[PDB]
Amino acid sequence: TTIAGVVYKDGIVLGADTRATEGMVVADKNCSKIHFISPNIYCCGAGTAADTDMTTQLISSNLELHSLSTGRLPRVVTANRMLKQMLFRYQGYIGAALVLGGVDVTGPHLYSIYPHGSTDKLPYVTMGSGSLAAMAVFEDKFRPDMEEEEAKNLVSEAIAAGIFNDLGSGSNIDLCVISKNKLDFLRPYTVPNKKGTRLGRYRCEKGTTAVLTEKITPLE
């Protein structure tokens, strides 16, 4: 698990990977780790998978309740206050590591949330198991107020450093670009890893398995 975010001169680029493991066995080769919050705010999830999923759906339901009652666009600082106040009440039992990012009237805002309830406003963050590898790419190559394709090149470089570290991915590098007006979301942005071809004949025969009892039930 390797997630990262950055703030360029106009918006926020998020990045993640596509592997969920159970033990030391790859359970999923294509998992979505970038979650919807609002039409300007997205959130990357890390930690316990079911804890991050059920948390990111509740707060996204409250902001849809909030903004439709209010009648205007939500704020990133509102989603910051809801998450750190909920997670503090569970005393860190819910294991959720989140990267919160969005563009408000006041501009872009990027946060990092720890499962005990501590939040940090930063221009660039990494979370997850391979966060140590992705952070070294940032500090070597971050400069303030980058352009669009310059910032997209930095994140896909930083995520790929964690992929070629352990607990990487069956790689489909994801990107979510949030700007002041345009919103992008790219699942197959980069496929660096391919599965090799199968060079053997595995001809399953029509009748090579003994059957004790058959049963037919039609439908309509």
Binding site: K121, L132, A133, M135, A136, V137, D140, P144, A161, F164
Partner: protein, 215 residues
């Protein structure tokens, strides 16, 4: 050794065209207190091989004492032979494996750089007797931080010159100052060539703090 009192930190190393460069800092921390601000963590073995280490520093003075004796013991024979850098890597592995079998290990992690017969050498030695060779090595937290920067350049370009390698180490030593809690902004760089072992002085880094003016 069951409790390491005075420990070091990450040690780097990478090959280039006709030599191996190794850098480490000069810090003698005790837990969280940095008690010793001026120590040397790189040992110059005779003319071709070269040693830097991490882990417990009192155990490092013991191996500095023993390896210093064995090199003198061969030079007094004068039979035209010396220890290859691979032979030091072989002896040191058997010393660490025989020590952990008595359940009284040496708390170290050692990197051996050497250049002999026109060939570079870069070897790793673990506390548990795990040893291998690599074109680039990093210990401690450097295996999480500087090691992705090492393997990125060596796959896009397999061979490096001396100036390309030395500039790349100072970039990685700059990074470890930002996020390792046991780092130190005064380090030294050691380099083997065909001319012999050469150790540079207490160099420093150049930091950036322009993101502090942001919120």
């Amino acid at each position: 050794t069951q409790n390491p009192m005075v420990t070091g930190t990450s040690v780097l190393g990478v090959k280039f065209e006709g030599g191996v460069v190794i850098a480490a800092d000069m810090l003698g921390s005790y837990g969280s207190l940095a008690r010793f601000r001026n120590i040397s963590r790189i040992m110059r073995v005779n003319n071709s091989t070269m040693l830097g280490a991490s882990g417990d520093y009192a155990d490092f003075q013991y191996l500095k004492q023993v390896l210093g004796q064995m090199v003198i013991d061969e030079e007094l024979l004068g039979d035209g032979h010396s220890y290859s850098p691979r032979a030091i890597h072989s002896w040191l592995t058997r010393a660490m494996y025989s020590r952990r079998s008595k359940m009284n290990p040496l708390w170290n992690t050692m990197v051996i750089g050497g250049y002999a017969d026109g060939e570079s050498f870069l070897g790793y030695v673990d506390m548990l007797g795990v040893a291998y060779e690599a074109p680039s090595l990093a210990t401690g937290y450097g295996a999480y931080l500087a090691q992705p920067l090492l393997r990125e350049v060596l796959e896009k370009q397999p061979v490096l010159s001396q100036t390309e390698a030395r500039d790349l180490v100072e970039r990685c030593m700059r990074v470890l100052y930002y996020r390792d809690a046991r780092s130190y902004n005064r380090f030294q760089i050691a380099t083997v060539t065909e001319k012999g072992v050469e150790i540079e002085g207490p160099l420093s880094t150049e930091t950036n703090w322009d993101i502090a003016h942001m919120i």
